[PDB]
Design a protein around this ligand. Structure first.
Ligand code: NA
Length: 137
């Protein structure tokens, strides 16, 4: 149920999508040290050619990372049927990187209604399809 939460802003202006990844809180520890080394992957999906991926820096040893990083995607007409996917991963020195939590927004959803504030981190499948804002609480 409880994978923590992330603070994001996302808006579309002038056929560009702007996303700011501020910080996340209460991430689920996964490493044997009881912390994680989180980074955020941003994609416009579907992305069959794997050309849209961007990512934050990895912050080592925290469950409350503060990235304060901004990204821009140049949009095309076909993006009307795409989603911005936002996934937190755990960078792992000696094993495969581990999924922590995710969400997504309709590119068309964001034109009508920019994202701002706290969001609940969802499981990997869920997060490709929807988002759950956590207003004032
Ligand atoms: Na790690």
């Amino acid at each position: 149920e409880k994978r923590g939460r992330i603070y994001l802003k996302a808006e579309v202006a002038d056929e560009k999508l702007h996303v700011t990844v501020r910080d996340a809180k209460n991430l689920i520890p996964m490493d044997p040290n009881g912390l994680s080394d989180p980074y955020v992957k941003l994609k416009l999906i579907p992305d069959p050619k794997n050309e849209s991926k961007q990512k934050t820096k990895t912050i080592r040893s925290t469950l409350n990372p503060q990235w304060n990083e901004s990204f821009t995607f140049k949009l095309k007409p076909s993006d009307k049927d795409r989603r911005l996917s936002v996934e937190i991963w755990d960078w792992d020195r000696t094993t495969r990187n581990d999924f922590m939590g995710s969400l997504s927004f309709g590119v068309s959803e964001l034109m009508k209604m920019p994202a701002s504030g706290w969001y609940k981190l969802l499981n990997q499948e869920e997060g490709e399809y929807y988002n759950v804002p956590i207003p004032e609480g």
